[PDB]
């Protein structure tokens, strides 16, 4: 439950983060990405180049990929801080991204998803069809799934670029999504989570119970965990579509969550992170220390890392 390090240096909100056993990488409204030592707290390098807020990022052993309100995606050499490619083509903010060894996939306020060659920096495909901002995306070797402010989820063939399915039924923006070989799970401003058959496009379940927008979700074979503007996290049985637990305790919207077999970790506009026993619904720990909303988090067996509107990242001992 104890704060281990406070990573100070960003000049505005932290929007996004990822960590491994050695480093934290954070993206900020101040238009930079920072690389930090997870154990010492030291700022290691600052990736400067974007002209507006960084919204989204991912990294591996060689590169960082960042997306920005300036409408670009940048690829950086994590080992030197040098900008390797700027992916230009979107007409408005990049909101979401994912990459693998070959390709970057980006989503934008311009309503499109683009597929790029990560080595050359050239666009391969533009996925056209949404009628408003793309908010979220995921891909694999075969398909892209995108969620949009137009209230739909779209499933695309990643090699050809063709729309395969448009999942219709949400009554407001899709905020979040995840998929596997069988199902798509989407969360919406309409306060529901929906489960869909990815091959047929059939709506399989509507998880009803939240009293305001669903902001975040994760699922596995057994359960969905959702976070909401109503300040709760809900745990659902995916098979019946019924809620198992409501995790109550946050005083404002839940913005972010992650779970494993034992625990849920949630971040909130109330400035705290909470650790919960997923089996019982009980709060195990409240991580107090941020001075404004928690926007983003990640955890493992040992530590939580949280990012905040207060411009800091914090590293916590998740046990005590």
Author numbering: 1 to 320
Q: How did the manuscript describe this experimental structure?
A:
A different computational approach was employed to redesign Tako8 to create Ika8, a fourfold-symmetrical protein in which neighbouring blades carry compensating charges.
The entire protein is well represented in the electron-density map. The tetragonal crystals show large solvent channels, and the monomeric form shows a pseudo-cubic arrangement of molecules around large symmetrical cavities. In both crystal forms the Tako8 molecules show a conserved interaction at the top side where two proteins meet face to face. The crystal-packing interaction is mediated by a hydrogen-bonding pattern with eightfold symmetry. The difference between the two crystal forms arises from different water-mediated interactions at the outer rim of the toroid.
